[PDB]
Design an enzyme around this catalytic site. Structure first.
Site, PDB file in Angstrom:
ATOM      1  N   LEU A  92      35.040  14.370  15.613  1.00 27.51           N
ATOM      2  CA  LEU A  92      34.230  14.185  14.417  1.00 27.51           C
ATOM      3  C   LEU A  92      35.116  13.816  13.236  1.00 27.51           C
ATOM      4  O   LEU A  92      36.299  14.162  13.202  1.00 27.51           O
ATOM      5  CB  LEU A  92      33.445  15.461  14.093  1.00 27.51           C
ATOM      6  CG  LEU A  92      32.373  15.954  15.076  1.00 27.51           C
ATOM      7  CD1 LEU A  92      31.398  14.825  15.365  1.00 27.51           C
ATOM      8  CD2 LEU A  92      33.016  16.445  16.363  1.00 27.51           C
ATOM      9  N   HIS A 108      36.563  26.456  23.654  1.00 28.24           N
ATOM     10  CA  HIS A 108      37.773  25.829  24.189  1.00 28.24           C
ATOM     11  C   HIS A 108      38.295  26.647  25.383  1.00 28.24           C
ATOM     12  O   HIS A 108      38.441  27.863  25.279  1.00 28.24           O
ATOM     13  CB  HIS A 108      38.840  25.757  23.093  1.00 28.24           C
ATOM     14  CG  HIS A 108      40.075  25.015  23.497  1.00 28.24           C
ATOM     15  ND1 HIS A 108      40.080  23.658  23.735  1.00 28.24           N
ATOM     16  CD2 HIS A 108      41.344  25.440  23.713  1.00 28.24           C
ATOM     17  CE1 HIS A 108      41.299  23.278  24.077  1.00 28.24           C
ATOM     18  NE2 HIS A 108      42.083  24.340  24.071  1.00 28.24           N
ATOM     19  N   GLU A 141      39.029  20.912  10.427  1.00 28.34           N
ATOM     20  CA  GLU A 141      39.553  19.556  10.472  1.00 28.34           C
ATOM     21  C   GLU A 141      40.749  19.545  11.420  1.00 28.34           C
ATOM     22  O   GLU A 141      40.991  18.565  12.123  1.00 28.34           O
ATOM     23  CB  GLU A 141      39.961  19.116   9.066  1.00 28.34           C
ATOM     24  CG  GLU A 141      40.044  17.612   8.882  1.00 28.34           C
ATOM     25  CD  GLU A 141      40.155  17.214   7.421  1.00 28.34           C
ATOM     26  OE1 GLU A 141      39.225  17.532   6.649  1.00 28.34           O
ATOM     27  OE2 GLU A 141      41.170  16.587   7.045  1.00 28.34           O
ATOM     28  N   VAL A 143      42.228  20.111  14.615  1.00 26.47           N
ATOM     29  CA  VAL A 143      41.754  20.238  15.995  1.00 26.47           C
ATOM     30  C   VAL A 143      42.131  21.549  16.701  1.00 26.47           C
ATOM     31  O   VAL A 143      43.291  21.969  16.684  1.00 26.47           O
ATOM     32  CB  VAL A 143      42.249  19.041  16.856  1.00 26.47           C
ATOM     33  CG1 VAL A 143      43.767  19.052  16.947  1.00 26.47           C
ATOM     34  CG2 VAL A 143      41.621  19.092  18.240  1.00 26.47           C
TER      35      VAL A 143
END
EC number: 6.3.4.13
Length: 200
Positions: A92, A108, A141, A143
């Protein structure tokens, strides 16, 4: 809280989330399921649950900041409060992650400070750890570096392959993702002002 699940494949975690939000005590309701691809069977499970489905497609137009805006429009259309990334294979843009700060969750397959990236199991096996796991965190933002909500350790067995280890970690994912969504949707957990997780 109104929820939107973004998928790109089978969506085994989606089913777990669907089953969880259907319980009488759930503080979350899944109102829209957005898929990256238009074939993936994630959309089918959504349909079986009677949840509105809707696709996009990068091939349809423009840059990155646009594709996200095409999604954000659907999110506004359904008055979404929380976003759950359930196997959404597509990064994104910085503004989108900005708009939904502290309102978007991701799962994750690693005990997160370790093995960031799209091939966590390969890294774990290559590194030789005997213990790995999964992590549910707020999307930032940076990752795979947002604030950690829940984690669950999973053992690595000798002779394990990506197929067998992912299968074992998946059982843990089906447990913490729904539990983490309930924590956020009920207001028990939120992105703390000091940047850290806050348990009210």
């Amino acid at each position: 809280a109104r929820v939107a699940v973004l998928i790109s494949g089978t969506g085994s975690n989606l089913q777990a989330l669907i089953d969880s939000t259907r319980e009488p005590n759930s503080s979350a309701q899944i109102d829209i399921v957005i898929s990256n691809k238009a074939a993936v069977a994630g959309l089918d499970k959504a349909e079986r649950a009677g949840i509105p489905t809707r696709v996009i497609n990068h091939k349809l137009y423009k840059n990155r900041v646009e594709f996200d805006s095409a999604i954000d429009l659907v999110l506004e259309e359904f008055s979404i409060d929380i976003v759950c990334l359930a196997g959404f294979m597509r990064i994104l843009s910085g503004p989108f992650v900005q708009k939904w700060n502290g309102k978007m969750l991701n799962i994750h397959p690693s005990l997160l400070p370790s093995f960031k990236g799209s091939n966590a199991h390969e890294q774990a096996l290559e590194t030789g750890v005997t213990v790995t796991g999964c992590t549910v965190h707020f999307v930032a933002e940076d990752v795979d570096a947002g604030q950690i909500i829940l984690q669950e350790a999973v053992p690595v067995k000798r002779g394990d392959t990506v197929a067998t280890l992912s299968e074992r970690v998946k059982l843990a994912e089906h447990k913490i993702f729904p539990a983490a969504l309930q924590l956020v949707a009920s207001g028990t957990v939120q992105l703390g002002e000091n940047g850290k997780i806050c348990w009210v």
